[PDB]
Amino acid sequence: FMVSLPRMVYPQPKVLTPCRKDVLVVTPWLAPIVWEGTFNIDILNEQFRLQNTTIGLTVFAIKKYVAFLKLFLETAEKHFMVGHRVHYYVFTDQPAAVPRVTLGTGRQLSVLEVERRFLSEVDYLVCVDVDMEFRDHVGVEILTPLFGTLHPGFYGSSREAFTYERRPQSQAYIPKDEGDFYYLGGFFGGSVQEVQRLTRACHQAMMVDQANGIEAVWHDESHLNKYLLRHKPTKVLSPEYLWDQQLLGWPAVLRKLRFTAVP
Ligand SMILES: [Cl-]
Ligand SMILES: [Hg+2]
Ligand SMILES: [Hg+2]
Ligand SMILES: [Hg+2]
Ligand SMILES: [Hg+2]
Ligand SMILES: [Hg+2]
Ligand SMILES: [Mn+2]
């Protein structure tokens, strides 16, 4: 089970004072939406460390994308799950091109040239795009059975504007009157079991579409959105977790820019 937390001194939560008055911090199915100010990282760090949590971070770097690995890994070392056990999984067609990045204690990297394995090596899997860089804290506050991240270009949009697959001939089809949020295909995760269930579902849905001669408007992301619509995530990450400052600047609603696209 889980052992007791130790004595800790921190500000008492205020029942009659809203966390944030500018954003939604909980979904209709009671999943928290992670924004700066909603969590006390010291409490969460304690909770996950007491469980000796290991987080796997997977990235695919093919062809010219291998050039993004150095910055990605170096910044992950400074901001991703610092203090916890981390196992990086770099899938690439150029294993010899992977840069030799210096890792902190308790962190390792495996190069897989281009599943069981994940179940016995890590507790959670975080799947992200490699042409990115960490700029601020990305920690255990995101860990949960299944999470999706709000696409920075649609967080304030109506479901009508969401670029979901709109053709009924596709397994990723989502009608104009359905949809909670538009999740990004570049940052999702959860327990190994839940992540594998999601990838398995999308892989099969994509095979059906292919056989039917159709390709979802935004490929994997379209299927990811259909999956999360029908299997509600247990946590939703705010756009703080995947932003593009060049394209979107730095709105007041974002107190931190944690993971961003590289110019
Ligand atoms: Cl991945
Ligand atoms: Hg708060
Ligand atoms: Hg993954
Ligand atoms: Hg899917
Ligand atoms: Hg897929
Ligand atoms: Hg997917
Ligand atoms: Mn990307």
- At 245 the three-state DSSP class reads helix
**What is the distance in A from the centroid of ligand 6 to the CA of 164?**
13
Q: Check whether 130 is labelled as a binding-site residue.
A: yes
**What is the distance in A from the centroid of ligand 5 to the CA of 198?**
9
Task: Please provide the DSSP assignment of 181-224 as one string.
Answer: --B-TTEEEEEHHHHHHHHHHHHHHHHHHHHTT---TTHHHHHH
- Phi first, then psi, for residue 54 (nearest 5°) are -120, 130
With contact defined as beta carbons under 8 Å apart, do 111 and 87 qualify? no
**Closest to 101 (Cα-Cα) out of 126, 80, 81, 75:** 75
Joined tokens for residue 44: 């969460």
- Beta strand 124-128 with 259-261: parallel, antiparallel or unpaired? unpaired
Mark the breaks in the chain: residue after which each occurs, C to N over 2.5 Å.
114, 115
**Closest to 177 (Cα-Cα) out of 191, 159, 195:** 159
Cα 68 to Cα 57, 194, 220, 261: the distances in Å are: 15, 28, 21, 11
**Closest to 184 (Cα-Cα) out of 152, 160, 156:** 152
Joined tokens for residue 199: 């990838």
Q: Check whether 93 is labelled as a binding-site residue.
A: no
Q: How far apart are CA 167 and CA 151, in angstroms?
A: 21
Q: Judging by beta carbons within 10 Å of its beta carbon (0-12, 13-18, 19+), is residue 188 exposed, middle or buried?
A: buried
CA 38 from centroid of its chain's CA atoms: 17
Domains assigned to the chain: 1-263 (3.90.550.10)
Ligand showing the shortest atom-to-Cα distance for residue 201: 4
Catalytic residues: 221
**What is the distance in A from the centroid of ligand 1 to the CA of 258?**
18
